[PDB]
Design a protein around this ligand. Structure first.
Ligand SMILES: NC(=O)c1ccc[n+]([C@@H]2O[C@H](COP(=O)([O-])OP(=O)(O)OC[C@H]3O[C@@H](n4cnc5c(N)ncnc54)[C@H](OP(=O)(O)O)[C@@H]3O)[C@@H](O)[C@H]2O)c1
Ligand SMILES: NC(=O)c1ccc[n+]([C@@H]2O[C@H](COP(=O)([O-])OP(=O)(O)OC[C@H]3O[C@@H](n4cnc5c(N)ncnc54)[C@H](OP(=O)(O)O)[C@@H]3O)[C@@H](O)[C@H]2O)c1
Lengths: 285, 288
């Protein structure tokens, strides 16, 4: 099964590498042409149009959806007819949904994706690559695409999903790093080093993560039982976190933000509910 | 051993504590404002007439009540002699300043003092799931180490400062609220497309594990003043944070959290740490 890869930054190379390493006749193109991939078995290509004509499966990985626009919008109406396009460029759900409409009007199958791992992980069990789009676009190329890693996974029909998953993962990542930093600062005031702190906090991170499947069950019904842990009882402790932060002269913006949300929930009379009732705060504005 | 211990305060957590001390074979005296709050004296527990009697019963006294204002209310009125020669362990939640205050007070009252914090629910007490942090001087902790281990294998002594247990509790709490809020932001986003929280959860917990593994390394960076980019500099985060905001606004979900995240990164860029790795943001968390 021949496959084409458009875009050869760090990630584009990894992608092409995995397709060669899995035995695919692999055609390649980049703006700045120029090499190692053609030195393994890769056929290099003269233009974008030649790259697209080479394979029924076309993969795109460039910096943003503006670059995607730049390389794909100029193509002939016929160039994509009957082909499957897989766009692994990072972007928003709206960008993905747009390319899906565009690709449909250009007579093509389209999968929108997102890579959640570094270039080194591609082709291993560490790779996570999410795909969204219709089954008719994915099933025929499932074997080919599995070549990027066992973590290559199909999320469902709506082309917006990969983006949304990538967003949920990113906000969680920033949330954790910032929580960690707030912690290290606090403890640093008493001279405890970050490296002493870390093993403590990773144990705790694991504990909290185990609570989430249950919080998900609560969110999927509209049912937020207190379980001796109601939002009201969090409130006092959040004040302490703020007072402690202020008093030691570290930043308190994060603790104050945390208290703000809980106050809102109390103000809509959800004081008596479990923490996951805060989903309503995250749903509005 | 049959080494006697007293427990003052019998809310959910106070009961669990007293339960663990009985279950470990300790002659266990008990007191609560709302007396008869009973099942404990129905196991082998001796109940007590007043706070003073409870303190006179045991060389080891443990306190677990709602806040340090309550602690003030029950302990300040005692005679100067009532605590002489005893070890007081306060497992009430509070601030480092509240802990350091009681340590001074307890010292002037002729007592050894450990300040602690419980990081687990009542059910976990007496098991391997219990985490109970203790801080204070070795002289206060060593002679009662066996007794206190009876609360769980996760019972741990943090060192001399009477403020450390509070500070560890704070770090753990802020991390906990940070993760839950991240999770809720995610669920709201994915909810717009009809994907259920329970579908989402296994995806996010895989990721949480991946990020946690980065932290020992981030700690090493923070402990030197050295924040190398590792092909992942704060500048390169910046574009993506804008997308998270634009996505949030556009789908009509809350965007305060994504905006807050971008705010901090902007500050770091404005002090010319754009080129550094993410852990250079510790400086933002250390000021204002
Ligand atoms: N590497 C990672 O850590 C990682 C992880 C997950 C996802 N991703 C995503 O993968 C995608 C690719 O990133 P990358 O690793 O390739 O980083 P990158 O090196 O910045 O991307 C470079 C690729 O984009 C092309 N490009 C950029 N602007 C262009 C334009 N106006 N016209 C034509 N081509 C343009 C570059 O062509 P030139 O030859 O002209 O430079 C090159 O092919 C990005 O969405 C990135 O977010 C990356
Ligand atoms: N349970 C948990 O999930 C958990 C987890 C970690 C830490 N903790 C901590 O454990 C400590 C105790 O909380 P808990 O869960 O046992 O709370 P609780 O169910 O509110 O029990 C609170 C205790 O506070 C006492 N109290 C409050 N004000 C008082 C006063 N002015 N004078 C005398 N006694 C007073 C109550 O006695 P009355 O019954 O007579 O009112 C009761 O024994 C708290 O600091 C809490 O943060 C609890």
């Amino acid at each position: 099964t021949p496959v084409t890869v458009i875009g050869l930054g760090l990630m584009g190379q990894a992608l092409a590498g995995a397709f060669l390493g899995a035995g695919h006749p692999t055609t390649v193109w980049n703006r700045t042409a120029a090499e190692p991939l053609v030195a393994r078995g890769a056929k290099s290509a003269g233009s974008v149009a030649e790259a697209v004509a080479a394979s029924p499966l076309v993969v795109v990985c460039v910096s943003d959806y503006d670059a995607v626009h730049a390389l794909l919008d100029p193509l002939d109406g016929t160039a994509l007819q009957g082909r499957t396009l897989v766009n692994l460029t990072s972007g928003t759900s709206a960008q993905a949904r747009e390319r899906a409409a565009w690709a449909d009007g250009r007579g093509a199958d389209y999968l929108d994706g997102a890579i959640l791992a570094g270039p080194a992980a591609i082709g291993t069990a560490d790779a996570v690559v999410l795909l969204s789009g219709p089954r008719s676009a994915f099933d025929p190329h499932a074997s080919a695409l599995g070549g990027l890693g066992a973590g290559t996974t199909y999320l469902g029909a709506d082309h917006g999903l990969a983006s949304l998953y990538d967003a949920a993962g990113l906000v969680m990542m920033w949330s954790i790093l910032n929580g960690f930093l707030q912690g290290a600062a606090l403890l640093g005031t008493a001279g405890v080093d970050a490296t002493t702190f870390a093993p403590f906090i990773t144990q705790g991170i694991g504990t909290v993560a185990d609570w989430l499947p249950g919080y998900a069950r609560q969110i999927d019904d509209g049912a937020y039982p207190a379980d001796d842990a109601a939002i009201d009882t969090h409130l006092a402790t959040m004040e302490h976190l703020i007072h402690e932060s202020e008093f030691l002269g570290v930043n308190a913006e994060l603790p104050r933000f945390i208290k703000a949300l809980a106050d809102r929930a109390v103000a809509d009379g959800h004081g008596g509910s479990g923490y996951p009732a805060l989903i309503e705060q995250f749903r509005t504005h």
